[PDB]
Design a protein around this nucleic acid. Structure first.
Lengths: 72, 140, 48, 62, 100, 8, 68, 206, 142, 141, 84
RNA sequence: GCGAUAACGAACGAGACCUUAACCUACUAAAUAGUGCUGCUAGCAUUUGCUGGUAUAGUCACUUCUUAGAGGGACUAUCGAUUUCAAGUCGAUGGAAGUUUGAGGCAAUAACAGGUCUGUGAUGCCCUUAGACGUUCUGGGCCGCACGCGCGCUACACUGACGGAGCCAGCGAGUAUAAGCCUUGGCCGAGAGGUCUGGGAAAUCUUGUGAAACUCCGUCGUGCUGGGGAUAGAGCAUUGUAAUUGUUGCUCUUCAACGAGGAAUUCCUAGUAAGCGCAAGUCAUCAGCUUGCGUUGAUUACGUCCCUGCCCUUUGUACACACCG
């Protein structure tokens, strides 16, 4: 009963996500959970959007694993 | 008829009946192209008899395999055996032996099972255990 | 309560109040005969 | 500072349960001062297994 | 001429093979085209019982067996020629059934 | 193992 | 282990002690030759018998053999 | 280098494999060298394989295990805890994605880190017990190189496995992080404290 | 795509005199209502025209009323009778779907009616032992 | 070259056909698709209620193409799964018969499928027409 | 059905006939030593390679005991035990 | 087995032997197996190509793969070592197979107060034998629950749950005037289940038993959570004369402990352990159980007498009903 990860994306976490993701060596579903404290479900919807917007280059695709790195 | 050879490759239970004729480089799995053979992870096991000596050796031959029985991996292993066993046999009957012997060197030096079928089968279960070696746990 | 059901509907199940006994194992010279009629050497001689 | 030893002759099994093997080693550098030492894992001849300390002989284990 | 089928069944093969063989010989010197004999996949008759008549001791099992083998022979011959072959090649081990 | 006793 | 028994050891060595010349340092010809000399009920037993026979001849060539 | 045309078309990605056989057709073994002389004869990187999946017979003779590919030997240590035994294809997926993670971190060759994480995680001195039938006694003996490569592989997979217990972090990146830290001597990782602890007690028993 | 909001989230809800967490997905959130499971909530969430990808706090007040009515009046919105809790009821014989508070009440009526008729099934409920034929020689240790 | 259903990967073909068979709209859909379970061993409904019947019928239609005169009873066994028996071991269970009876009926009167002799349901003249057409409009991207 | 009766070629070589032949001799009160060897030499008369007769139970005593009377050559294990 | 030898040569057991697994493009044939051709036909590109169906008269060929019958094939084969240079063993080469080639069946001399008169029209003795302890039929029981223990199954989550999509094994079973088998295919039912036909007395049909793990794609996001399905209610069917003490299943609902197990202790060395399913059995209904089969498939030894057990020798004996002396 310690997780308390946020499942709804509010305004302060919106720009913080778009500001901290570029400064990441390698991200994953758990990595966003680990440092951005967002939920795993919120991690998937957040990551799958950043790929279309050019922030993230897709290293590999899989259902159970999403390996991503910076696109800059 | 034409330069046609028929053979079979086997794994634990899966057996692949492969037909190799003379023609264009058609490599089919039950009428399906090899580039989609499942599982995706072991797709290169079937590619091994191709890329080891190169896709060039298959330009003059068309291969259609019919694999039945066994499991997912076993059918993969029986097919990749049939391609190597079919190709090696083909150069015996319609090509010189040196090239036929040459393929036997790269294949065997990479995988022993490419030309030689494995003899392993599942050991029968013995009474007193839920396996072949294992037994019911004994209580004192 | 002549019918057997009437008691069951009103009787209380006081089974968790009493502690079970700590030990309850309740199920010796096998080689020593208890028949009491030995075999004579003439019976063995006549028989076998 | 680690030193390496090349095994040259398999003597036999030692220890209580026989899981450790007495073996004769040879020094890769300064090929002298042959020392009898114990090895836990399976050993064929010509193993380049290393030694944290060399100034200790090895005998039968109880 | 008639499309006729003959089936050979038994538990033992030396008896089964003998009946199969000489009938084929009867269609060799006789110019009757032959199909067969077809060796049917053998059927093993197994039953797993318990060795102990009572229920004491080790857990050990008895696995008895029967092997039954089938041979079907196809004939293109008149009913008289096919019938006389069976009585020539009658032997107790194999039952003989003839079907047109 | 029990001595059959009647009532009727 | 692959230790030969006495029934394959003594049966083989009698063959040398009676048919030394026609044997040869090769198994297959010895395998066929022992198939005609001795009545062997099982082919596994004959392959066991013939195998020790050639091995004894390999020993006879490299020195004097004991008991033959 | 030329593209070869087939009736059943062959994609370009696989066509790269003719010039060099590569792990998952993504990693090459030629730029990898093992930093321990004793473990050279017992580590098998010479033969490239497309996948760490051979289905051979290495359990027939004594030292056949040193001839199994190190990638297959690493994966064969993943499927444990009953629920995983016999799930090799899953274990390959776990390792194959992990190698990709190992690459995007520090940009090194993933299998080079595998080599780096093995020679440093194989316990070199272990204290055997010489207790006289019940009493406690310990005595330090050496470790064979074959017992060193495998004890590295055996211990390495455990550290990721426990790091992935009751943890949102998946096993693949747990295995990815377990291999990368152990490569550089990270005392924070598992099988590095244990390697030092297993060696330290030998220093107290010789 | 991820969106943003402020003040439109409802952390704590009160449906059928029962609290519902807002951080959990709605379709499984409704399971916290007694008499409502995952299977039933999935049918009513789509009947209430609520997409399954929303949290309980994301929903509006109107949808919250739209949820309870389909909960409280199941047969009125093409929900099958066999999909209900108690069809062919003891007294009126009509199809009802019970909810949070009313379950243990009608269950007590079920227990009292079965106890009043002093059958075997009712009596064992009074004793507190397993009713459905379970053996209790070695497993009844709780 | 001639592209057929067997020349297309199995997984991505349905993701395109199911969209087309959904957009085509001539496929009739029974009213209980949003209520009932696909498999008796299943415990939850399909997570895409808006397209499961279209996504299912696309798989069934192409499955009919690959084989000969396969009936609805065989269709239940293939689509059934391992029931989550609570403490008892998992067992194989056949799926719902009515949906697969409707799935063939929905595809039969649309011209894709029809009754075959000696049982089963053979693909129609126009069944092979569009399926190989869908294959042409699948792998080109 | 047609049933014919034929006399056996070797009575001693047949372990069947001698078993009931022993049964008739046993019932007449003859001592076991006289009865047991009375058939053994008959089997050895017939040329049978070996013969073993086992009598177990009670004779004038409460305790049960066994007496095995082996003669000649014996095979005990394997496939030939069914043929010979 | 070699070797040593007051012993020499033998017999039983072991091993040999039989059944099964692996090899056979080398024979023998197979419309109840398959293939390739050839017709007849259908799709897509139009290259003549690629994928199906059909042909118990296309009155085609073949047995590579499927089946079984006659055989061959391995005998530690060749070579390095080690050893008494002997029996053997260890490393390589070839080989289908070089661990007793793999697994089992059989399995010695006497014996045990081991277990069964609860399998026999197998029995000796004691008891009963007509108000029968025979038999039959009715209603109940072996399930009954303060408790200790054992064989196991679910699980304790993310290598994971579901929801879709891929879609591959092998051992086996089956009826007629019955008293009902496997039951397809179709038609209804959310399901379970219901109806109408047919085939199969059997490599034909049930059945390719299209099994699950597994593969891919999304939802869940460490929460006793959607991991788990105990306790409990309602309704719907089947089985059987008869289901109440719920036969069994299904639908909804009810959402229990369990967050990896103390002291101890069990099984196991290669397709093995461990997961994952299916069949036959007891069966009118019921399988968390055995007996078999198959899918995926390892870690580490290939050593020792440290624990335990047994065997052998020496030794001691006042034991021989043999230390339960």
């Amino acid at each position: 009963d310690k997780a308390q990860h946020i499942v709804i994306l509010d305004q302060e976490k919106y720009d913080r996500i778009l500001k901290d993701v570029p400064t990441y060596k390698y991200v994953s579903v758990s990595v966003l959970v680990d440092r951005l404290k967002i939920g795993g479900s919120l991690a998937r919807v957040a990551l799958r959007q950043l790929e279309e917007d050019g922030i993230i280059t897709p290293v590999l695709k899989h259902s159970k694993q999403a390996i991503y790195t910076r696109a800059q | 008829s034409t330069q046609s050879v028929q053979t079979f490759g086997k794994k634990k239970t899966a057996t692949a009946v492969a037909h190799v004729k003379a023609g264009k480089g058609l490599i089919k799995i039950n009428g399906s192209p090899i580039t989609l053979v499942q599982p995706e992870i072991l797709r290169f096991k079937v590619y091994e008899p191709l890329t080891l000596v190169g896709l060039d050796k298959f330009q003059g031959i068309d291969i259609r395999v019919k694999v039945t029985g066994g499991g997912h991996v076993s059918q993969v292993y029986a097919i990749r055996q049939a391609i190597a066993k079919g190709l090696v046999a083909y150069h015996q009957k319609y090509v010189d032996e040196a090239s036929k012997n040459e393929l036997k060197k790269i294949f065997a030096s990479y995988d022993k099972t490419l030309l030689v079928a494995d003899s392993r089968r599942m050991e029968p279960k013995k009474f007193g255990g839920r396996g072949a070696r294992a037994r019911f746990q004994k209580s004192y | 309560k002549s019918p057997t059901g009437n008691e069951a509907a009103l009787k209380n199940k006081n089974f968790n109040k009493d502690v079970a006994p700590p030990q309850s194992t309740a199920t010796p010279f096998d080689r020593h005969s208890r028949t009491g009629k030995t075999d004579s050497k003439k019976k063995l001689q006549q028989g076998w | 500072p680690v030193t390496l030893a090349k095994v040259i002759k398999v003597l036999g099994r030692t220890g209580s349960r026989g899981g450790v093997t007495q073996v004769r080693v040879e020094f890769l550098e300064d090929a002298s001062r042959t020392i009898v030492r114990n090895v836990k894992g399976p050993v064929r001849e010509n193993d380049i297994l290393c030694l944290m300390e060399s100034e200790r002989e090895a005998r039968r284990l109880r | 001429i008639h499309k006729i089928r003959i089936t050979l069944t038994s538990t033992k093969v030396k008896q089964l093979e003998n009946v199969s063989a000489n009938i084929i010989r009867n269609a060799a010197q006789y110019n009757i085209v032959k199909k067969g004999p077809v060796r049917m996949p053998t059927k093993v008759l197994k039953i797993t019982t318990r060795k102990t008549p009572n229920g004491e001791g080790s857990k050990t099992w008895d696995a008895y067996e029967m092997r039954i083998h089938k041979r079907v022979i196809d004939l293109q011959a008149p009913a008289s020629t096919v019938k006389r072959i069976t009585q020539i090649t009658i032997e107790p081990g194999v039952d003989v059934e003839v079907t047109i | 193992r029990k001595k059959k006793v009647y009532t009727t | 282990g692959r230790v030969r028994t006495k029934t394959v050891k003594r049966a083989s060595k009698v063959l040398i002690e009676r048919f030394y010349p026609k044997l040869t340092l090769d198994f297959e010809t010895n395998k066929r030759l022992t198939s005609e000399i001795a009545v062997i009920q099982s082919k596994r037993l004959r392959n066991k018998i013939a195998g020790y026979t050639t091995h004894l001849m390999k020993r006879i060539q490299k020195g004097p053999v004991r008991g033959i | 280098l030329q593209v070869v045309e087939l009736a059943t078309t062959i994609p370009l990605d696989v066509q790269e494999a003719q010039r060099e056989v590569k792990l998952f057709n993504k990693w090459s073994f030629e730029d990898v060298e093992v930093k321990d002389v004793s473990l050279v004869d017992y580590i098998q990187i010479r033969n490239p394989v497309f996948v760490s999946h051979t289905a051979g017979k290495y359990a027939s003779k004594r030292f056949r295990k040193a001839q199994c590919p190190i990638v297959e030997r690493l994966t064969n240590s993943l499927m444990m805890n009953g629920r995983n035994n016999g799930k090799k294809l899953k274990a390959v997926r776990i390792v194959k994605h992990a190698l990709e993670i190992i690459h995007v971190l520090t940009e090194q060759n993933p299998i080079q880190v595998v080599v780096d994480a093995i020679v440093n995680s194989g316990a070199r001195e272990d204290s055997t017990r010489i207790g006289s039938s019940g009493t406690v006694r310990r005595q330090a003996v050496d470790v064979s190189p074959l017992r060193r490569v495998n004890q590295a592989i055996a211990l390495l997979t455990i550290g990721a496995r426990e790091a992935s217990f009751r943890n949102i972090k998946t096993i693949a990146e747990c295995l990815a992080e377990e291999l990368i830290n152990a490569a550089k001597g990270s005392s924070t990782s598992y099988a590095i404290k244990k390697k030092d602890e297993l060696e330290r007690v030998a220093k107290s028993n010789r | 795509l991820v969106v943003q909001e402020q003040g439109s989230f409802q952390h704590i809800l009160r449906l059928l005199n029962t609290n519902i967490d807002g951080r959990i997905k709605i379709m499984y959130a409704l399971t916290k209502i007694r008499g409502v499971g995952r299977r039933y909530a999935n049918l009513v969430c789509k009947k209430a025209d609520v997409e399954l990808t929303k949290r309980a706090g994301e929903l509006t007040q109107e949808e919250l009323e739209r949820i309870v009515t389909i909960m409280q009046n199941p047969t009125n919105y093409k929900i099958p009778a066999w999909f209900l809790n108690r069809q062919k009821d003891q007294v009126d014989g009509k199809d009802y779907h019970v909810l949070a508070n009313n379950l243990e009440s009608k269950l007590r009526d079920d227990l009292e009616r079965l106890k009043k008729i002093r059958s075997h099934r009712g009596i064992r409920h009074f004793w507190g032992l397993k009713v459905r034929g379970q053996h209790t020689k070695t497993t009844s240790r709780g | 070259p001639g592209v057929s259903v067997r020349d297309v990967p199995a997984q991505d073909f349905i993701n395109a056909y199911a969209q087309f068979l959904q957009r085509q709209g001539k496929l009739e859909v029974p009213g209980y698709v949003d209520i009932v379970k696909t498999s008796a061993g299943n415990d939850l409904p399909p997570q895409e209620a808006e397209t499961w019947f279209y996504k299912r019928a696309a798989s069934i239609a192409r499955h009919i193409y690959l084989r000969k005169q396969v009936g609805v009873g065989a269709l239940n066994k293939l689509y059934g799964g391992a029931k989550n028996r609570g403490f008892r071991p998992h067992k194989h269970v056949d799926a719902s018969g009515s949906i697969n009876r409707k799935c063939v009926q929905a595809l039969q009167k649309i011209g894709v499928l029809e009754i075959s002799p000696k049982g089963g349901r053979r693909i129609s003249e126009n069944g092979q027409r569009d399926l190989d057409r869908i294959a042409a409009q699948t792998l080109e991207e | 059905i047609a049933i014919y009766a034929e006399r056996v070629e070797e009575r001693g070589l047949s372990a069947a006939v001698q078993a009931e032949a022993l049964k008739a001799k046993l019932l007449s009160g003859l001592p076991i030593r006289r009865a047991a060897y009375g058939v053994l030499r008959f089997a050895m008369g017939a040329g049978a390679k070996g013969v073993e007769v086992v009598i177990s139970g009670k004779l004038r005593a409460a305790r049960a005991k066994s007496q095995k009377y082996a003669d000649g050559f014996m095979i005990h294990s394997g496939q030939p035990t069914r043929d010979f």
